[PDB]
Amino acid sequence: GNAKIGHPAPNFKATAVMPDGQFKDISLSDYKGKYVVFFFYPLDFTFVSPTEIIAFSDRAEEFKKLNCQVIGASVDSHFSHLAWVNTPKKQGGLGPMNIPLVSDPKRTIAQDYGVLKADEGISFRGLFIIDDKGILRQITVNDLPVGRSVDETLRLVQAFQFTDKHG
């Protein structure tokens, strides 16, 4: 992996399912000027991952007030993401999303971020906080069974923005 604290976060260009439900090719560099929370989850149509994704989506406004873009990603195809979004939450899907979901079918983004579980071809639960300069500020990687906290992620984003202010 090439993700190093204090260095530019590895860029990517990938197809995402955008909040409007439609495909768009996006790049991490598209969000320079904003903080970014970039998180991986292992795969679509699973048990723990939708709880995390929906939590980040539901609370997207709290990141927007921090000028912070949230982006999720898995090695699934962009069609698989679309299927999951188009499946209602009450039927085990994601439902409508407030955040883009990146597809990493070549596994190169997960590799660049050091979160590929090589023996399965899927990502660990990696989460990365990138500042408005594109510099990586925080690395979080959970083994597959344990999910992430939106509260903790907001705490971190808020703290980096506060400490960015001292000069």
- Closest contact distance (angstroms) between CB of 81 and a second copy is 24
User: What is the total residue count of the chain?
Assistant: 167
Site for ligand A1LXC in 18-47 (CB under 6 A): 41-43, 46-47
By the rule CB under 8 A, 77 interacts with a second copy: no
- Give exposure, 13-27, as e/b (b: 16+ Cβ within 10 Å): ebbbbeeeeeeeebe
By the rule CB under 6 A, 6 interacts with ligand A1LXC: no
Contacted entry of ligand A1LXC, a second copy, none for residue 42, CB cut-off 5 to 8 Å set by kind: ligand A1LXC
By the rule CB under 8 A, 139 interacts with a second copy: yes
Strand partners, 16: 24, 102
Return the structure tokens found at 97.
Answer: 């999303």
Site for ligand A1LXC in 97-126 (CB under 6 A): 122
Q: How many CA atoms lie within 13 A of 18 on its CB side?
A: 9
By the rule CB under 6 A, 144 interacts with ligand A1LXC: yes
Q: What angle do CA 57, 59, 60 make, to 5 degrees?
A: 65
Give the binding site for a second copy (CB under 8 A): 4-6, 117, 124, 137-143, 145-147, 149, 152, 155-156, 159-160, 163, 166-167
